[PDB]
Amino acid sequence: WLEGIRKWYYNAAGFNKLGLMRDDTIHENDDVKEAIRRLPENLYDDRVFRIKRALDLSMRQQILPKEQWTKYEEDKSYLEPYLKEVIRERKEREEWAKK
Amino acid sequence: EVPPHPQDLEFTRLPNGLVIASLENYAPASRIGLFIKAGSRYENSNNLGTSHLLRLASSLTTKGASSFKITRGIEAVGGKLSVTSTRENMAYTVECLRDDVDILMEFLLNVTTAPEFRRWEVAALQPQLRIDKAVALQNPQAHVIENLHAAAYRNALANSLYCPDYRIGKVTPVELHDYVQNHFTSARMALIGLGVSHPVLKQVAEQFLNIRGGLGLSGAKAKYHGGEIREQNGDSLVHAALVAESAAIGSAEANAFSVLQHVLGAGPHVKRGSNATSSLYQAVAKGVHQPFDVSAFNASYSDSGLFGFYTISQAASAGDVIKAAYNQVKTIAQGNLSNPDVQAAKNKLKAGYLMSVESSEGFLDEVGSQALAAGSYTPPSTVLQQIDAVADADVINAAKKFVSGRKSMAASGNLGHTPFIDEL
Amino acid sequence: KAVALQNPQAHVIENLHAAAYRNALANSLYCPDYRIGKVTPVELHDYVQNHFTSARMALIGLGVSHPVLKQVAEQFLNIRGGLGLSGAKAKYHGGEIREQNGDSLVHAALVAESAAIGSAEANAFSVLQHVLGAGPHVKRGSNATS
Amino acid sequence: SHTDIKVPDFSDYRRPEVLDSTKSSKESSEARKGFSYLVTATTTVGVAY
Amino acid sequence: AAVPATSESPVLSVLCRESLRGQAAGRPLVASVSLNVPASVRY
Amino acid sequence: AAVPATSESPVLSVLCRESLRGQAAGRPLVASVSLNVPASVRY
Amino acid sequence: ATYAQALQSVPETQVSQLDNGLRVASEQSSQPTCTVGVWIDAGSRYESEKNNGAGYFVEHLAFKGTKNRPGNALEKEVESMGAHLNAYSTREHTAYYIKALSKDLPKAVELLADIVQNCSLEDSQIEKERDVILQELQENDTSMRDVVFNYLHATAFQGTPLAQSVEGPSENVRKLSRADLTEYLSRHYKAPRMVLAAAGGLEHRQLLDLAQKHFSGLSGTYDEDAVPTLSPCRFTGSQICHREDGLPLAHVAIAVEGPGWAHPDNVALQVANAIIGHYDCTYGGGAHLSSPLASIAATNKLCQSFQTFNICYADTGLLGAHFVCDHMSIDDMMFVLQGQWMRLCTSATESEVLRGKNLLRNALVSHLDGTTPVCEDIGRSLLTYGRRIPLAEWESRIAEVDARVVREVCSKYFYDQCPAVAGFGPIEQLPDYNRIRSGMF
Ligand SMILES: CCCCCCO[C@@H]1O[C@H](CO)[C@@H](O)[C@H](O)[C@H]1O
Ligand SMILES: CCCCCCO[C@@H]1O[C@H](CO)[C@@H](O)[C@H](O)[C@H]1O
């Protein structure tokens, strides 16, 4: 049932109500910080504004008008290619550290 | 003891233009180099310094090997990877024990045919341009020779081996990609090997170095102009070079200039010696009794060349040393040249050439350069014959060409007493 | 120096003089980088003593009475030193200095030796300057007479 | 010249066993260190008690 | 790699003819960079 | 005095003929330094 | 071929000896050029305080003319045949060598024989060189590296001949007389103390005959009361700090006592030193370098450069490192460096030792590249080991090294041992000797 429940969960989760994209909510560990540092200017700046807008809404205990909510169908991972490579590089260093 | 092997150099030019040359010496270690026509002369006004950064980026991430792997992998087998550049060529060389050539070759191929020039790695490397340049420029000779080329040519050969300051932090990934794509092509390369079999290098080149290239003034003939650049910096000693256009490497006239270089004096032969047979040195010594150094300067390129002399003296004596040196060359141009002087010069030149291909580094540089310059191999015995063939009149005529030719000059130090070209 | 050199014209005009003359007028108005931190007190004293002399000075005033200015000069500027240490005559040479810096705009100046200020020939050059065009006269104009 | 710099004579401070400049001091190093170690071990045990 | 350069570079000589002898440039320069060895500049 | 310079200097755009007009140098330069006013460079 | 078969194909070095004691050694190749020279067991370790600098003074006179070739005649002859004549002096060895076309080997040997036996030593030339040397002393003073290394020897070998610099103190330079020099020469330049070595396109038999022809007159006796023998040199745990805040970077050299030339332990020590390695700001590896010291230094910008070293003398030596850094980075650099020596003593891993072994293999072979490096190896080896050690032997010695051998050998020379320390420049942050000593365990 993992598509119907998915869209339902997405909305129940509600980060979309603050105008955030899923990757904007990831918990930042060292791999994530490096991935974010590698983002091209436009994606980095977009991320910064979406987060700032969400924090502002959160402070006011408000949410965006429904028509501005991030849509399940339009949310894509902008961070994945960068994060995947950062993890791959680390794993490689770890395998070499064991020799 | 009586050695094995000695074997001969194997040479092979492929249809695409790539040259492969190898010498099996049965040594315990191997030396492989990929020579490319990608020196600084191929940069243009919009991408100056791109080849300098490229020279410093050999260990950045590639499609087949991460930056981390290139460093750890080469070090694991106690190997070496270096990039050497002149105004015309770039040479990527690897060194390792003979059983590990497979490993070094894979990294070499990744570095030269599959670099990724990742945005963040390229940005992080920029500062290195500043460090590398500062180190090189600690040598006044570097200042003077770079300025000499800039003063002599309107383009191409005028470009510096080091990135201009305004470009540091501005060289983009796209410029690096374009530079590799426009110049690292089959017809512009030579794969040279020492202590490696010709078949394996041939195989490697056939399978991984079959590359066609874009555009790649990345062909532009160097246009000699003449001029002078004076760099005042108040150093106790003045460094100066005075040259005129000479001849392209590969021509017979180039040989005359090489012999003239050794008649005048091309470097010391005896530790702390008085350079008794150096014509320029003895001429200056008679008039100047302050410390100084003087030497004939000879640079020969594919489509041009610069010939003259270089001086180092106390600032107040700059004029005296330079004029005395110049006058000495004028006497040669007037025909005052003895046969014994010419034979001695020929001996120094011949012994000097043979000594320069004595080590693997010199050997490789010689073969690689011939491969890119003439796409052929001229053996030592032939070179020595071409040297013996130079006539006393050819030497005199080279001197004349220098004396009457439009000059280029570069000087650095406290220049209060350093003359201008028109005062010579 | 960094402030002044933010103006490309400064770069070009200083290099122009350095290219044109073998000496004197070839010197820049700004201290060479290698000399920053090296100018000594003795050099400053030497410079003032060789050039700040009576025969090389003029005290000019506007909005002050001539008598007071005259008495000030008589009592406090009654120095000596005569003509002081004049320099060597400027020797025009000619040459070119090219500064590659990749700016979208190129600034360039081309000159030849003209005439010393005070000569009649200098007046001809001043008129030639205005025939050719010596600066705008109308805000955003097309400089129709330049 | 920096070559005019010679270390001053320390013979009045040296332990007897390292007074001969023509002899290696490695033969006494073990004894010289063993003593200090003995002094430190004994202090540690005293304090522990 | 294994062999360190003759002169190691740091960032931030001559007083006699003898020590000056050989310093004058005689050929075009070459610039080298390495993974394991100090960079160098010839002539 | 209390008249600040026309342009204040700071240390560590043009896009049209109109705004470029007047920028070409026409005379030797003058360098000025002050106790109370921003430095300037003419022509 | 494999690296192994290639090792067994190097021509064996041929060694002969003349009646007067002179050893003649050569390695034949097919090079149309060669290097031939004379290596001598003479150096400042053989000098006393009275004549320290004598050997270096002689080096200055060696090419200034011989009885057979006065003034610049020797010079003109070398130059006209396109040969190169060079020399060098160290605390234990002195060498004079010529690079020339193989066909000129006879004249090359004659010239060397002439130089080593008939040096003029003209009083006027001696006075000229006196000023040259004084000026060289001033120039050397500007080389922080040379200064710190002379300081390391001065303190580590204080009170012994090894503490002396090669050039000698300036007052000796001002006072050395021809008598002093001829005396030095008659005593040290004897056939039994020399090795005529050559590498390149030549045959041993030809070299030997040329040696018999030109070096037979060389004395091989001396006597008994005047046979300069070497006494062991005591090493002293100590420190010499020349503080000069006016200099931009600090130079520090630290070392423990090494075993000396002949000891088998030098191979394992070389492996260990290869593991720690060398570094400078122009290295492309940076944060990824295998040596922990190198990557820490590069990522944290701890120094401009550093280099491990194993300086060997007859029966002692200096084993350690030298680094150049900013005044605020000295303690950190010393901390990381000592931590690495301790890690090797107690926890060297098989993989890093293998890397060290491969680095050493590459360094050994790449060093013997050309007739000059080979000729020098022949000359020096004969003086130090009394034989040329073949590559196949070096490989066997390197092969025997593993993590266990590295921990044990390093523990033997580094663990809880007193080091000799020399510092020069803005060194306010150079650690106190007690703290450095505690860092050794
Ligand atoms: C100095 C120019 C950059 C050198 C290329 C290496 O770049 C490094 O690669 C690592 C993977 O091992 C990454 O984890 C690290 O974030 C990255 O900066
Ligand atoms: C740590 C190992 C010490 C002994 C190594 C000896 O090694 C042996 O030396 C012989 C003579 O040089 C060679 O002919 C032989 O091939 C080599 O394996």
Side-chain angles (χ1 to χ4, degrees), chain A residues 2-99, chain B residues 1-4 6-424, chain C, chain D, chain E residues 1-7 9-11 14-28 30-41, chain F residues 1-7 9-11 14-28 30-41, chain G residues 1-221 223 225-441:
Chain A
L2 30 169
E3 207 53 39
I5 59 183
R6 271 184 197 298
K7 186 168 178 179
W8 169 79
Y9 179 76
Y10 189 80
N11 286 295
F15 50 81
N16 65 324
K17 294 171 180 152
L18 299 183
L20 295 162
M21 286 179 82
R22 168 257 250 173
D23 287 356
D24 299 333
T25 74
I26 197 168
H27 177 40
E28 302 189 20
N29 60 15
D30 292 324
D31 291 329
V32 176
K33 298 193 189 71
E34 179 52 23
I36 289 169
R37 190 188 71 80
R38 298 179 176 194
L39 287 180
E41 270 268 331
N42 70 302
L43 293 180
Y44 174 93
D45 296 333
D46 287 355
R47 171 184 235 259
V48 165
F49 184 67
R50 286 195 302 278
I51 285 174
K52 187 169 171 56
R53 181 177 55 179
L55 293 173
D56 180 67
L57 288 165
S58 172
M59 163 197 81
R60 291 187 272 104
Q61 294 296 23
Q62 265 145 55
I63 60 172
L64 294 171
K66 192 174 180 182
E67 51 271 357
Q68 300 179 216
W69 295 0
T70 314
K71 294 184 179 72
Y72 171 72
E73 302 86 345
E74 306 176 352
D75 197 335
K76 304 302 171 186
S77 180
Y78 59 80
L79 205 59
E80 168 169 47
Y82 303 96
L83 184 49
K84 171 191 290 50
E85 178 61 17
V86 168
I87 292 169
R88 188 179 87 176
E89 295 178 336
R90 174 168 59 66
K91 287 300 176 63
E92 176 174 53
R93 298 195 296 278
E94 289 172 359
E95 278 292 293
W96 276 78
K98 290 158 184 160
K99 285 197 179 180
Chain B
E1 173 183 43
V2 169
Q7 295 216 161
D8 281 71
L9 180 151
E10 292 183 66
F11 184 109
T12 301
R13 192 174 181 285
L14 298 178
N16 58 8
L18 191 141
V19 172
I20 294 108
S22 58
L23 174 73
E24 172 58 74
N25 57 2
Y26 297 114
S30 308
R31 191 189 188 85
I32 298 171
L34 181 62
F35 293 67
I36 315 175
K37 291 187 178 175
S40 61
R41 74 169 291 153
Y42 298 109
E43 297 173 354
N44 60 47
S45 199
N46 301 315
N47 70 352
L48 294 178
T50 299
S51 79
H52 179 188
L53 186 56
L54 182 58
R55 173 164 83 253
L56 304 179
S58 73
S59 70
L60 294 200
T61 297
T62 65
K63 292 171 186 171
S66 68
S67 180
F68 174 89
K69 185 174 180 184
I70 289 169
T71 302
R72 293 307 188 82
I74 292 178
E75 286 192 303
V77 297
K80 189 164 319 207
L81 168 66
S82 68
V83 190
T84 298
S85 310
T86 55
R87 281 182 165 65
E88 300 200 295
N89 306 151
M90 277 190 80
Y92 288 75
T93 71
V94 290
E95 301 164 53
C96 62
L97 298 182
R98 60 187 305 132
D99 302 325
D100 302 306
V101 165
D102 54 351
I103 297 173
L104 272 293
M105 192 58 30
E106 186 181 321
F107 287 127
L108 176 59
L109 291 172
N110 267 289
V111 172
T112 60
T113 70
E116 289 188 353
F117 299 129
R118 292 176 175 192
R119 187 164 43 69
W120 52 90
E121 295 192 359
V122 169
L125 181 62
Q126 303 286 325
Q128 197 60 33
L129 287 166
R130 209 175 292 288
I131 291 176
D132 192 61
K133 189 176 181 180
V135 169
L137 300 201
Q138 284 197 80
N139 296 297
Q141 297 88 332
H143 282 266
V144 175
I145 301 315
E146 291 307 279
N147 284 335
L148 185 69
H149 286 83
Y153 298 103
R154 297 172 197 289
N155 65 324
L157 290 174
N159 300 340
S160 178
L161 290 180
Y162 300 93
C163 183
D165 289 344
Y166 83 92
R167 287 276 291 158
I168 295 176
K170 312 289 190 183
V171 188
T172 68
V174 162
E175 297 181 317
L176 288 162
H177 275 295
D178 289 352
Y179 201 86
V180 168
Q181 283 159 21
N182 291 327
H183 311 99
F184 285 36
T185 72
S186 280
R188 305 173 71 90
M189 302 177 346
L191 182 60
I192 319 303
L194 183 65
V196 58
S197 93
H198 197 71
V200 303
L201 280 187
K202 178 168 182 168
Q203 200 157 304
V204 158
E206 268 158 26
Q207 313 215 295
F208 302 105
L209 288 174
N210 209 327
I211 310 161
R212 299 270 286 288
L215 295 51
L217 286 65
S218 288
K221 277 284 180 170
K223 296 300 186 179
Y224 185 89
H225 175 221
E228 66 199 316
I229 291 180
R230 296 165 68 84
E231 179 182 293
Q232 172 72 26
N233 64 40
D235 292 354
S236 46
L237 302 177
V238 167
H239 280 240
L242 176 72
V243 302
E245 184 166 36
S246 51
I249 208 159
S251 60
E253 182 176 10
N255 291 308
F257 276 104
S258 294
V259 169
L260 173 58
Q261 171 183 31
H262 291 72
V263 164
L264 296 172
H269 287 263
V270 181
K271 195 189 186 182
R272 299 190 195 88
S274 70
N275 306 296
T277 65
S278 166
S279 176
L280 281 185
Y281 201 91
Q282 291 305 307
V284 176
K286 298 168 188 174
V288 69
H289 297 68
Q290 314 303 162
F292 74 81
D293 189 23
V294 60
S295 164
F297 178 89
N298 193 60
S300 189
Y301 300 109
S302 72
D303 58 350
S304 185
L306 295 179
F307 175 90
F309 60 82
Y310 191 109
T311 66
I312 300 181
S313 69
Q314 293 179 303
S317 298
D320 299 333
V321 175
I322 290 164
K323 292 180 179 177
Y326 193 45
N327 289 335
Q328 178 54 38
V329 184
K330 281 186 186 183
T331 73
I332 302 298
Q334 288 157 7
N336 298 293
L337 172 70
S338 78
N339 298 123
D341 290 327
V342 177
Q343 189 51 56
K346 282 183 176 177
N347 286 353
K348 294 173 177 183
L349 184 57
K350 292 155 69 182
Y353 179 67
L354 294 180
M355 279 173 199
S356 74
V357 301
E358 213 180 276
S359 73
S360 68
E361 171 165 292
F363 175 76
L364 216 78
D365 182 42
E366 183 55 42
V367 181
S369 298
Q370 274 193 51
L372 292 188
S376 68
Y377 179 61
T378 299
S381 50
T382 298
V383 179
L384 300 182
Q385 289 175 53
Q386 301 180 329
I387 286 171
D388 291 319
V390 172
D392 282 36
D394 299 328
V395 179
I396 287 170
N397 282 159
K400 290 176 183 293
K401 183 165 185 164
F402 168 74
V403 172
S404 58
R406 185 169 166 179
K407 309 287 189 308
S408 293
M409 185 180 176
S412 73
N414 185 341
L415 313 179
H417 288 177
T418 299
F420 287 84
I421 292 177
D422 63 11
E423 302 177 316
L424 294 176
Chain C
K1 189 177 182 182
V3 169
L5 299 201
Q6 283 196 84
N7 296 297
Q9 298 86 334
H11 282 265
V12 175
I13 300 316
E14 291 309 276
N15 284 335
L16 184 68
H17 286 81
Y21 298 103
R22 296 173 197 290
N23 64 325
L25 290 174
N27 300 337
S28 177
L29 290 180
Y30 300 96
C31 182
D33 289 345
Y34 82 92
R35 286 275 291 161
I36 295 175
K38 312 289 188 184
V39 189
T40 69
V42 162
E43 295 180 319
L44 286 161
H45 276 295
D46 174 69
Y47 203 83
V48 168
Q49 289 163 8
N50 290 330
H51 311 99
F52 285 37
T53 71
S54 67
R56 304 173 73 92
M57 295 173 12
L59 181 62
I60 316 305
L62 182 65
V64 56
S65 91
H66 197 72
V68 303
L69 199 63
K70 176 171 182 168
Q71 178 59 202
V72 155
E74 266 156 28
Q75 192 137 59
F76 304 105
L77 284 175
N78 185 38
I79 59 175
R80 288 295 180 279
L83 289 178
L85 247 60
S86 44
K89 298 151 191 61
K91 297 299 187 177
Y92 184 89
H93 173 223
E96 64 200 317
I97 291 180
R98 297 165 68 83
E99 179 181 293
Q100 172 70 26
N101 65 40
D103 291 354
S104 45
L105 301 177
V106 166
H107 279 239
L110 175 71
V111 303
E113 184 166 37
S114 49
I117 210 161
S119 59
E121 179 177 13
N123 291 307
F125 276 103
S126 292
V127 168
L128 175 57
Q129 171 183 32
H130 290 72
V131 163
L132 296 169
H137 288 263
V138 180
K139 195 186 186 181
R140 300 193 194 84
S142 68
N143 307 293
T145 65
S146 166
Chain D
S1 171
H2 74 279
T3 62
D4 296 327
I5 294 172
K6 176 186 170 182
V7 174
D9 172 55
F10 277 101
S11 60
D12 260 299
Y13 291 105
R14 287 171 170 282
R15 296 191 182 188
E17 55 271 43
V18 300
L19 280 168
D20 194 342
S21 68
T22 64
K23 301 295 188 300
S24 164
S25 293
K26 269 180 176 175
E27 185 60 294
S28 66
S29 84
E30 181 179 291
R32 289 183 279 113
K33 278 187 301 147
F35 186 49
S36 284
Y37 174 81
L38 177 48
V39 170
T40 296
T42 302
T43 297
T44 295
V45 161
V47 170
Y49 168 80
Chain E
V3 289
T6 176
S7 178
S9 52
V11 179
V14 179
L15 291 159
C16 66
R17 273 181 191 173
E18 283 74 10
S19 298
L20 205 48
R21 189 45 187 142
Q23 294 299 299
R27 285 136 292 144
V30 185
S32 300
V33 166
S34 197
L35 155 72
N36 280 311
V37 172
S40 67
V41 71
Chain F
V3 286
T6 176
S7 179
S9 52
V11 180
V14 179
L15 291 160
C16 65
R17 273 181 190 174
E18 283 76 8
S19 298
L20 204 48
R21 189 45 186 142
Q23 293 299 298
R27 286 135 293 147
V30 188
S32 301
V33 165
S34 198
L35 167 63
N36 277 308
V37 172
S40 68
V41 71
Chain G
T2 50
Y3 161 71
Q5 288 176 299
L7 287 192
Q8 309 285 335
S9 72
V10 186
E12 173 197 54
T13 292
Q14 304 303 297
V15 180
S16 297
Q17 182 177 291
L18 301 187
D19 288 310
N20 55 14
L22 173 76
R23 276 165 294 170
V24 185
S26 62
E27 185 197 282
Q28 167 173 20
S29 76
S30 56
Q31 303 262 42
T33 40
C34 70
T35 295
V36 56
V38 178
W39 268 260
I40 313 167
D41 266 325
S44 52
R45 186 181 176 167
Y46 292 89
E47 297 170 347
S48 75
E49 284 175 287
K50 305 268 185 170
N51 71 356
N52 180 200
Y56 188 66
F57 211 124
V58 165
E59 184 196 310
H60 273 258
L61 299 167
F63 311 152
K64 304 296 181 191
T66 78
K67 296 165 182 165
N68 297 303
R69 302 176 173 78
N72 70 356
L74 166 71
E75 203 173 274
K76 295 189 180 184
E77 186 152 15
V78 168
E79 286 166 48
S80 62
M81 74 178 108
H84 289 267
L85 178 60
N86 193 27
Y88 70 71
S89 311
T90 72
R91 295 181 167 76
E92 294 189 324
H93 311 124
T94 301
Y96 296 105
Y97 68 88
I98 294 175
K99 289 174 62 60
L101 287 169
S102 295
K103 69 170 191 173
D104 293 320
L105 180 66
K107 179 94 300 175
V109 179
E110 192 187 335
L111 291 179
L112 283 172
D114 192 24
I115 287 167
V116 164
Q117 305 172 80
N118 317 310
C119 185
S120 295
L121 304 182
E122 317 282 51
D123 296 309
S124 53
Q125 193 64 55
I126 286 176
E127 285 314 312
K128 294 189 184 184
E129 296 317 302
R130 208 186 289 285
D131 289 310
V132 171
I133 296 175
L134 289 172
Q135 292 171 186
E136 284 172 346
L137 288 186
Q138 299 192 309
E139 313 177 331
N140 291 351
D141 277 2
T142 68
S143 174
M144 292 189 74
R145 190 197 184 203
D146 293 343
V147 170
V148 86
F149 271 95
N150 276 333
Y151 281 176
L152 182 60
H153 286 78
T155 196
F157 301 117
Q158 58 183 264
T160 81
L162 268 182
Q164 294 174 149
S165 69
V166 168
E167 301 84 2
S170 64
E171 196 55 28
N172 270 21
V173 180
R174 303 188 187 101
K175 294 170 176 165
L176 276 173
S177 68
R178 186 179 200 281
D180 293 317
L181 306 183
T182 56
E183 196 173 304
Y184 169 80
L185 286 168
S186 79
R187 229 167 73 69
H188 303 286
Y189 284 35
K190 313 283 288 184
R193 306 248 288 161
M194 307 175 32
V195 176
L196 173 68
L202 64 118
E203 308 183 313
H204 186 63
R205 48 195 277 302
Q206 308 178 313
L207 179 63
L208 179 52
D209 259 296
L210 290 167
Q212 272 156 171
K213 175 167 184 178
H214 301 291
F215 288 83
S216 299
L218 201 40
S219 175
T221 305
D223 52 285
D225 50 306
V227 54
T229 194
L230 296 181
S231 295
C233 292
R234 173 196 64 195
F235 175 106
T236 302
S238 52
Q239 192 154 319
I240 179 172
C241 299
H242 182 160
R243 180 132 175 222
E244 219 299 50
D245 285 356
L247 307 184
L249 299 167
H251 276 237
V252 178
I254 173 172
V256 292
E257 181 180 21
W261 288 115
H263 212 293
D265 285 349
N266 284 300
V267 176
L269 288 175
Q270 291 292 179
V271 171
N273 271 357
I275 294 170
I276 290 167
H278 44 84
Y279 172 84
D280 88 40
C281 57
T282 67
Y283 282 29
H288 304 152
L289 295 170
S290 301
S291 160
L293 179 55
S295 61
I296 301 304
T299 73
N300 293 286
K301 314 289 194 171
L302 297 184
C303 66
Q304 302 284 204
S305 72
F306 81 73
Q307 61 180 146
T308 53
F309 58 72
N310 187 40
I311 303 176
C312 309
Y313 292 121
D315 30 16
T316 188
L318 296 171
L319 173 72
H322 161 261
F323 62 81
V324 176
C325 67
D326 166 75
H327 74 114
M328 291 308 294
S329 299
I330 309 178
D331 189 72
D332 284 342
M333 267 309 291
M334 186 66 69
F335 177 83
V336 181
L337 165 65
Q338 287 190 299
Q340 288 309 301
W341 286 334
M342 297 298 93
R343 192 178 62 65
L344 287 189
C345 290
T346 70
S347 333
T349 69
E350 295 298 351
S351 67
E352 77 187 316
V353 168
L354 170 57
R355 172 169 60 84
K357 287 165 62 174
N358 288 331
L359 281 169
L360 187 50
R361 284 170 174 133
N362 278 272
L364 266 187
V365 309
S366 60
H367 169 48
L368 304 175
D369 177 30
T371 69
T372 302
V374 178
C375 185
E376 191 274 336
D377 191 48
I378 295 170
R380 172 177 47 62
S381 291
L382 266 281
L383 287 184
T384 60
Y385 314 126
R387 71 195 175 86
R388 180 88 192 289
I389 299 175
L391 290 179
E393 189 183 312
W394 285 123
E395 172 53 35
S396 282
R397 288 177 176 283
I398 292 171
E400 287 296 315
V401 182
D402 64 356
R404 190 204 108 247
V405 171
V406 170
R407 290 182 190 185
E408 289 184 28
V409 176
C410 282
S411 292
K412 185 183 175 181
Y413 299 94
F414 289 115
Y415 203 71
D416 194 25
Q417 295 297 326
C418 292
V421 179
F424 183 35
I427 54 175
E428 187 181 81
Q429 203 195 65
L430 173 62
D432 165 81
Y433 188 85
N434 278 310
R435 293 287 289 277
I436 293 179
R437 184 61 184 68
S438 289
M440 298 307 277
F441 75 84

